[PDB]
Amino acid sequence: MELVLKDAQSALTVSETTFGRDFNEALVHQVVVAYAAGARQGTRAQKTRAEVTGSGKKPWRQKGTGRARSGSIKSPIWRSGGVTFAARPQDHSQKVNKKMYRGALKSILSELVRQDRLIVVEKFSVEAPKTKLLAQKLKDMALEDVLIITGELDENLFLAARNLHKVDVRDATGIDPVSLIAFDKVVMTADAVKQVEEMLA
């Protein structure tokens, strides 16, 4: 599988089972859903009738009066009563198998290739940590909404990309499927390709 490069107009040999796999939408949808469920914090609670501040006394007697039977003022049918099925803090994280996660990444990286949403360059550096320099470089590349994966830790690039919301900069380890989809273009360093292909076999 060969990936032509943008700047030097060379090639780069990759695994076809990685970058030419057919797009398995149901797998990718499962993984993207589980990622967005993993982001989910799940911090809420309501009060039951057990937890409502009150007293456990019958507001009136059982019979004799003309009113309906009642046992508790904390009743979930009363105003300022309990919630019937009051919630607890719960964990919404799903399990994704490892081979399913890699199948999804190999699917959407193959799809970004088929959609020409993947750009491969040898190097992507900014000299000084300036967002003005980064916006100039991306304008020269004709890029606005982009993910930038670099096989190294470039701090000037992180700082120059921190203020731009259209732009995100990742390590090759810190890539995610939802960000590979949510961004319009993806720029990979060829070293970052070598690391991604090695991780993903």
Binding site: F23, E25, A26, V28, H29, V32, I108, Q115, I181, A182
Partner: protein
């Protein structure tokens, strides 16, 4: 391929019942529960094996047997598992290193199941007749 183009597979997501939301849903006022039983009650239902007051089957019937502690420390081995060890020799410590039988195991038999295609020295283990023939045919050497 965007986040607004994904759709799951057919038959993957099924809706799920929502009892007590109208006539048209089917699951109307009672919600699949019928009328005026114990089963229709909240928390209602009888425990396992309850046949009314009739003597349940697990008490009509007698207990039998006992439990062998030695059976917990015995194991059976396929012939296909013999290749997963290294060195071509088969012990208990070799099989435990190959994660086949487990640590607490003290006894093991080799059983005619699967097939082996390599000479393997078997040492200190019981062997069935068909496994003895298959090992000796593939070049093995059963010893103690």
């Amino acid at each position: 391929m965007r986040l607004n183009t994904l759709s799951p597979a057919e038959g993957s997501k099924k809706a799920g019942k929502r009892l007590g939301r109208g006539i048209g849903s089917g699951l109307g006022k009672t919600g699949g529960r019928g009328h005026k039983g114990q089963k229709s009650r909240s928390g209602g239902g009888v425990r396992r094996g309850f046949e009314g007051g009739q003597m349940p089957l697990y008490r009509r019937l007698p207990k039998f047997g006992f439990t062998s502690r030695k059976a917990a420390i015995t194991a059976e081995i396929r012939l296909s598992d013999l290749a997963k060890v290294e060195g071509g020799v088969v012990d208990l410590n070799t099989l435990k290193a190959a994660n086949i039988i487990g640590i607490q195991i003290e006894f093991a038999k080799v059983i005619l199941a699967g097939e082996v295609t390599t000479p393997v020295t078997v040492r200190g283990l019981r062997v069935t007749k068909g496994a003895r023939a298959a090992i000796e045919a593939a070049g093995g050497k059963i010893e103690e």
